[PDB]
């Protein structure tokens, strides 16, 4: 299908094929030197340069080397610099370049590449969609929004642009407006729309507006393999881990940590109240659009398995106590934090990002009435000095209708069935 040979490259097709056959047979190192020889002999050949890049790309995979991949990324660029590069090959080379830049975390580099692609191919809608993904990946939702608004002005029924536009709207708390874009986008079945993120946020958006069809989309999300169940909708998972909303200390095996939290709960409370009284600013408002209403702030001691030294100056004895429990201080997919919630607060139904952690709540200051937490089909209350344990990859909902503040201590632990190797290898969240 693709036309990759310009006029000169057609005259050396026998040599180009021989080198490419070496690559397709898995003789990567022989293919590198073969294409390198062709680049030496024919330094302007775009197909030879692309062959070199692809071989370097394969060599990077074989060696699992970022340095080798950086070489490939530059060679993909060289292809586009050569004279008389066929359009198909130019597009293939810069698209792989961008993709590999994203793989290495060179998001700004990928963005420049994607911008160049859209400039070279102004009518390729899929490339504009890719540019929007580049913006999303660096957290630039405003520019991502403009990209998809441009796509939809020309191709209003582009499903990929709809789901991503809906995703952006919901992230901006434009809940009602996001529902038709997310729904119509998924229903389009266009490549890239069968993605758990869009089922996740469509159902959540619907729950927020009182649309009872929310769970028909969680069920379909479950049927298509995006959710372990309609209740447990995390998207960064290790399959097979025991899945239940509520855990006992003994079921977790972390009984020593629970004992230490409950035996020493008053010193944890007291350092939290001291920060409340003398270092309020260490409590930061919840910033994930999870509240319908109310006031909810958190004072974080560990995140992504990293101690916040300055925060621990505000709770030094608590940080010292917890240092003995790497099952939580080393949980790179959880946090250790105080959480204050005030009356008039309602947290929408939601799930966390991963099934790789379990969440402990230690009650510190609990009004006698008005505070409760639901996980899956079961609602519970906190007790001062007592630990609750739940899996927040299951849907949770929270209410605070007391007449004074509610303070808890949150301690995330690795899921107990995760191996030591998994605990070291899983990317942080």
């Amino acid at each position: 299908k693709p036309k990759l040979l310009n006029k000169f490259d057609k005259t050396i097709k026998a040599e180009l094929d021989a080198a490419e056959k070496l690559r397709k047979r898995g003789k990567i190192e022989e293919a590198v030197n073969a294409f390198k020889e062709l680049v030496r002999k024919y330094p302007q050949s775009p197909r030879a340069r692309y062959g070199k890049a692809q071989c370097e790309d394969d060599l990077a995979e074989k060696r699992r080397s970022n340095e080798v991949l950086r070489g490939a990324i530059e060679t993909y660029q060289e292809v586009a610099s050569l004279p008389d590069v066929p359009a198909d090959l130019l597009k293939l080379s810069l698209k792989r370049r961008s993709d590999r830049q994203q793989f290495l975390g060179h998001m700004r580099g990928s963005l420049l590449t994607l911008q160049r692609l859209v400039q070279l191919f102004p009518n390729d809608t899929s490339l504009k969609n890719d540019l929007g993904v580049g913006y999303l990946l660096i957290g630039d939702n405003d520019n991502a929004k403009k990209v998809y608004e441009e796509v939809l002005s020309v191709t209003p029924n582009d499903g990929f642009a709809k789901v991503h536009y809906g995703f952006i709207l919901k992230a901006q708390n434009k809940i009602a407006e996001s529902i038709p874009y997310l729904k119509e986008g998924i229903e389009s079945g266009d490549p890239g729309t069968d993605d758990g993120r869009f089922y996740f946020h469509l159902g959540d958006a619907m729950q927020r507006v009182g649309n009872k069809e929310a769970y028909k989309w969680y069920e379909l999300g479950h049927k298509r393999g995006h959710f372990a169940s309609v209740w447990q909708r995390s998207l960064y998972n290790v399959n097979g881990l025991k899945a239940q909303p509520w855990w006992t200390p003994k079921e977790t095996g972390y009984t020593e940590l629970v004992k230490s939290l409950e035996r020493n709960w008053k010193l944890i409370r007291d350092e939290g109240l001291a920060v409340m009284d003398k270092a309020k600013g260490l409590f930061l408002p919840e910033d994930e659009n999870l509240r319908e209403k109310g006031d909810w702030s958190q004072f974080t001691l560990w995140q992504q398995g990293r101690r916040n030294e300055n925060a621990c100056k505000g709770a030094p004895k608590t940080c010292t106590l917890l240092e003995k429990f790497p099952e939580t201080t080393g949980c790179r997919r959880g946090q250790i934090k105080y959480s204050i919630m005030h009356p008039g607060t309602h947290v929408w139904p939601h799930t966390g990002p991963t099934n790789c952690r379990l969440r402990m709540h230690l009650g510190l200051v609990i009004p006698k009435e008005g505070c409760k937490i639901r996980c899956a089909n079961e609602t519970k209350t906190w007790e001062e000095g007592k630990v609750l344990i739940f899996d927040d990859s299951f849907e949770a909902e929270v209410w605070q209708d007391a007449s004074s503040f509610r303070l808890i201590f949150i301690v995330d632990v690795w899921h107990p069935e995760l191996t030591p190797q998994q605990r070291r290898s899983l990317p942080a969240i």
């Binding site: 975390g105 998001m107 990946l137 957290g139 995703f167 939601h350 799930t351 966390g352 990317p427 942080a428």
Partner: peptide, 18 residues
């Protein structure tokens, strides 16, 4: 932005190559 209590970011993990 980080996914701490929810799942609101386009991606919750960082990209660091191999």
């Amino acid at each position: 932005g980080k996914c701490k209590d929810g799942l609101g970011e386009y991606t919750c993990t960082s990209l660091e190559g191999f």
